[model samples]
Target: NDAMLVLISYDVSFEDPGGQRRLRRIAKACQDYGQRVQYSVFECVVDPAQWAKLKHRLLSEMDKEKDCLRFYYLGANWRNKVEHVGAKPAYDPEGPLIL
Candidate 1:
């Protein structure tokens, strides 16, 4: 299975904004479509079809706030990707465990 990473950042400060609501809706859509979001900017085990759906949804939402928002999509294989806040650490089976 492969992971899909979605990197989204915005310029305008959202005041009691709809970001959380949007995130939840996006997460639900991903889950319902059989893909798992691994990080705020990423997803896991997404097929090409799912990726397209995600892109469409994001674009639609961004269009509503076109003046104050920007969106980007990054596949998992990109090098030197900037880490988005609130992303989970990748699971390492053989790495040292911090218990």
Candidate 2:
């Protein structure tokens, strides 16, 4: 299946041990799906089905009272929709990845 671009960002308040654990779990889950473009932001290229699964997993790991998660759907035209003007170079998930 072809994948589309989706941006995921999270704000996790760490006020206690449980909060810290949740943060780690959420970060790990996001790392599994995409690259961490920022401290709490991730860029993912995933199919609709995969996105749904990732969303469910993140929701389960997050505390609604303490954490906030946002998803931005850039669609298939994301390449033209995004622009960068800083030192942090942009990455193309569809491009060659040197692992």
Candidate 3:
């Protein structure tokens, strides 16, 4: 099997309409350039050239209100099964970074 390519998911900010537009642009670009594997995910047989092109396209759609969007670039072995809490912890009990 070829290396598994996955797009790490991200949340659109509730206050940013601009981000939503940018997200739509990204989805379209993925379909045009990459393969659509999920609602907000894409998969491809990993290639540096293709990855650069995708990144460039995405960056071009970004604007000053970038806070509206978030992205995670996952490597070949990345797993999407892990759970993620929607909200950040208020106080970190573990150590300095926890807070």
Candidate 4:
């Protein structure tokens, strides 16, 4: 199947022993799979299996007792479903990077 777009956001509470570590790992994991579109928000394109894999990885890295995670599915019709209005023009989620 084709890759589908998804938006992921998270909030990590930094009061426990490894709280900051968890936050950093979660951020790194998100960046590895998506574009940082906003503070703590990433936009990604992943197939079904990949989504589950990514979910599992993140779940393992986070402390469910202190951290919050969210995933927003944009589906196959993502292009028509997204809207952008801001200073920086929207880049295609599927667009290539020169760097």
Give the TM-score of each candidate.
0.40, 0.75, 0.47, 0.75
What is the C-alpha lDDT profile of model 4 across 32-64, one tens digit per residue? 565677656677778888888888988898778
Q: RMSD of each candidate?
A: 7.0, 4.2, 10.9, 4.4
Q: Which stretches of candidate 3 lie over 4 Å from their true place?
A: 1-6, 14-16, 32-45, 68-74, 77-99
Candidate 1: where is the Cα deviation over 4 Å? 1-17, 31-40, 63-99
**Cα lDDT, model 2, residue 88:** 46
lDDT agreement with native, every candidate: 0.45, 0.74, 0.50, 0.72
By TM-score rank, best first, the candidates go 2, 4, 3, 1
lDDT value, candidate 4, whole model: 0.72
Tell me the deviation in Å of residue 41 in model 2.
0.9
Tell me model 3's lDDT, rounded to 2 decimals: 0.50
What TM-score would candidate 1 get against the native?
A: 0.40
What's model 2's TM-score? 0.75
Best model per lDDT: 2
- Better candidate by lDDT, 1 or 3: 3
Tell me how far candidate 3 lies from the true structure as C-alpha RMSD in angstroms.
10.9
Candidate 4 versus the native: TM-score? 0.75
lDDT value for candidate 1? Answer: 0.45
